[PDB]
Amino acid sequence: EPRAYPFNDVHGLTLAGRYGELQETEPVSRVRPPYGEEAWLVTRYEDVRAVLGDGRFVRGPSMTRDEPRTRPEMVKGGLLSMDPPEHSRLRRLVVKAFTARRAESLRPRAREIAHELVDQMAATGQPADLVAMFARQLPVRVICELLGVPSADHDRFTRWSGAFLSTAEVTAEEMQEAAEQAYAYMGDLIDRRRKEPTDDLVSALVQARDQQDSLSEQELLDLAIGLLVAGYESTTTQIADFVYLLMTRPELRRQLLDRPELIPSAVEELTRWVPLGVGTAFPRYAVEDVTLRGVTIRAGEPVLASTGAANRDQAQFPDADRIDVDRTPNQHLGFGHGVHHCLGAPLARVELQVALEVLLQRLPGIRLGIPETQLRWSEGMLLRGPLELPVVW
Ligand code: HEM
Known part of the structure; x- marks a missing residue:
């Protein structure tokens, strides 16, 4: 009498x-x-x-x-x-x-x-894999800039970081070694910044004060790694999925080529429209009985609040299945809601706006190099996205 869940096909x-x-x-x-x-x-x-x-x-x-x-x-x-x-x-x-x-x-x-990523794509020739060469590259590198990882370490930090993607084909010991390297590297950077601060996020975290409170050594370390994992796969998948939509819906690509200033707005509409999760993660737990739509949720029961479905609710969004890049208002829950509202959303928006801007400007004709029905889709079972996106332009 419950329904088998998830409902979405991956x-x-x-x-x-x-x-x-x-x-x-x-x-x-x-x-x-x-x-x-x-x-x-x-x-x-x-x-x-x-x-x-x-x-x-x-x-x-x-x-x-x-x-x-x-x-x-x-x-x-x-x-x-x-x-x-x-x-x-x-x-x-x-x-x-x-x-x-x-x-x-x-x-x-x-x-x-x-631009550097697109350089590397053009250097190997059509078709290129947009997933491996761009979507999986841009968000981890940007996190490197954010935290303050010196340029010379981006490549290894990126290499360690891919072991954490749910699509990675690595044994647990392999992922474990990547994780210990990431942690040791991040702990050393944090200690450098303490004694010699710069303008980067690690420095600013080391110095954050809140009426006399500060972040502990372990807090700094867990929060820095936590931002990496929260900020990597999500943005990577969503870049892939927006470009897939751009390449397969000509009207959407035409609208953004004609009016590139619509890109921020399109980012919000796509974040609303794409039911990125396979299911909904992060159940909430009732602390006391609460009645919702005349059903009583008892104290202690888990509740899955689907933002995927919320975002496509006809009662809230006129013609909710239509992608309308100028949609206003657009009070979508794609970055969550309440105290846990995505803390990297401003950065996620920057990245998604830049990915669209740069690909559209460098490759206005970007399209699938194979037919739609031959695309391989991730079965990592957390987010939905293509495993590879071979593209021509
Ligand atoms: C398109 C990319 C992204 C999407 C779609 C996304 C979505 C979300 C959502 C829905 C939540 C709320 C989860 C819930 O309450 O159940 C969340 C939380 C969070 N996000 Fe993101 N996110 C993205 C990118 C990022 C980035 C780039 C970072 C860090 C730089 C980040 C860091 C975090 C953190 C740390 C939380 C937990 C906040 C808390 O519990 O206070 N996210 N994100």
Whole structure:
């Protein structure tokens, strides 16, 4: 009587029709995931936003619960597993340093890196793999600039970082060695910056103060690695998926070639429209019984608040399945909502705007080098995206 979940097919970006059916007839429903507990699934925009914003729905139990999910292992810890006040304290120190102004200051380096990537693509000739050569490269390098990794170390840091992608074909010991190298490198950079500060994010994190509070050595280290993992695969997949949409919907490419100033707006519309997750991750837990759409969620039960479905809710977004690059208003939940709202969103927006700007300007004719129906799609079971995007231009 729960439904098998996830509903989305991983081989594409289609939103399962089941979501809209539940938005209509069962907006709070039971689901059985592949691993972990059965959970409530919430699908209307209004309810999803309400759950993400509501004090009674917490993430701390994540640490001691068998979370509904699609893969056997649980990746636990980080900001997303904490609740106020502990969460509030760390996030306060991190945003003091990782400001939206800092994000914007990286646009020029981000463009430069994007151009370098496109150079390497042109150097090997059509078709090139846009995933391997651009999408998997740009977001990890930008994180290198953000943190303050010296230029000479970008290549190895990028190499270690790919072991963390859910699509990586590496043994656990291999991923483990990549992780210990990343941690040792990051701990050493943090110690350099303490004694000799620069303008980078690591320096600013080392010096963040909040009425006399500061980040501990371990906090600095976990937060820096945490930003890497939170900021890499997500942005990489979303770059791939936006370019895939650009290449397969000519009207979308034509609109942005004609009016490149629409790119920020298109980034928001695509973030709304693409149901990037396979399912919804990061169940919330009820701290007390809460009634939602006349169903009582009992204290202790997990709730999956689907932003994928929320973002395509006809009640909130006129003609919600239409991609409209000028869509206004566009109060989408693609970067989440409430205290855990994506802290790298300003940087994610910069990156996605730059990726589109630079590819469109360098390769206005970029298109698939194979037919659509032959694309291989990631089965990592966390995010949806193509494994390879061979492109011609
Ligand atoms: C297109 C790319 C991205 C998307 C779609 C995205 C989406 C999200 C979403 C939906 C959340 C909320 C998760 C939830 O509450 O369940 C989140 C949180 C978070 N994101 Fe992102 N994100 C992206 C890029 C980034 C980048 C580039 C960084 C860091 C530089 C980053 C760092 C974080 C962190 C640290 C959190 C946890 C915040 C907290 O718990 O306080 N993200 N992101």
